[PDB]
């Protein structure tokens, strides 16, 4: 059919639970600003690429 | 003892209250806050008196330590120190005695006396037996 009133939660009930894995903790506060000022400005990129964004794949 | 310096400023004597009042600033670099029993015996050897009429209070320490400051004064008689002195700082030392009941107790006693008219043969012992 077209899903009238049953299967509420149809896709959350059958999504496979990939586990949440853990990482070393994030530097918070004033140190958080330090480690991302240093990633954007004092790290000048050697190559071109039309200034591709900070989340490229 | 080593560095506990007792200075003062804004000194005044007034014979309205028969007192000598001043602002006391205590210089102590590496100690905690000096007690008031430590202070008032040191003004006695500065002002040529005995520590029975020196009443000090209100010491508050600056951020970082060192200079704490409070207000203090000296009377001219311990009889003067019992008349024109508020009763709490007279009692910090053992010169005044204030052991009353709580004001919850005193207020219920007052409204119980109010309901009993006239008789000294019942107002005095109005419900004092249950103890």
């Amino acid at each position: 059919v077209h899903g009238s009133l049953a299967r509420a939660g149809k896709v959350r009930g059958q999504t496979p639970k990939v586990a949440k894995q853990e990482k070393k903790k994030k530097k918070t506060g004033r140190a958080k600003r330090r480690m991302q000022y240093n990633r954007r400005f004092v790290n000048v990129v050697p190559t071109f690429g039309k200034k591709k964004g900070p989340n490229a794949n | 003892n080593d560095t506990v310096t007792i200075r003062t400023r804004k000194f005044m004597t007034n014979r309205l209250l028969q007192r000598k009042q001043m602002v006391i600033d205590v210089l102590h670099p590496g100690k905690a806050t000096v007690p008031k029993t430590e202070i008032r015996e040191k003004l006695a050897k500065m002002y040529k008196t005995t520590p029975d009429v020196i009443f000090v209070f209100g010491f508050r320490t600056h951020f970082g330590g060192g200079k704490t400051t409070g207000f203090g004064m000296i009377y001219d008689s311990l009889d003067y120190a019992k008349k024109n002195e508020p009763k709490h700082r007279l009692a910090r030392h053992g010169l005044y005695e204030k052991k009353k009941t709580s004001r919850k107790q005193r207020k219920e006693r007052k409204n119980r006396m109010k309901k009993v008219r006239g008789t000294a043969k019942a107002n005095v012992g109005a419900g004092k037996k249950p103890k």
Partner: protein, 141 residues
Amino acid sequence: GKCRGLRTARKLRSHRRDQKWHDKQYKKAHLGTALKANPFGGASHAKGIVLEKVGVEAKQPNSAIRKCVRVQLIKNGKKITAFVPNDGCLNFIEENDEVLVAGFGRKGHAVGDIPGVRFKVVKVANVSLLALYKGKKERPR
């Protein structure tokens, strides 16, 4: 044109005050029949009880069923339909639960493709609908 002369401030002021009765945002705020008629009665939230799990069809561009309820308010009791804005949270609610319906976003107009709903449900059975989604809180045993 307009009347400009100095001393016509009775005419300019009395004409401005009865021409403000011709837009929405003055007249729905200053007449009184637009606040006697909304179900919250001049409030941002209201409690009510669940009457019927209902499903409404989305608009023609869309094709889905939106999971809604039929809240009947515990204050000045009157019927609304309200949306349960989550994935599986039609199942966290059941018959005659008490809920806290909120506004749906744009003050008495529907948002999105849900035809004729005006409210959304938060806080079913005194626990939050987000907390039941994330699992920070459970339904009361």
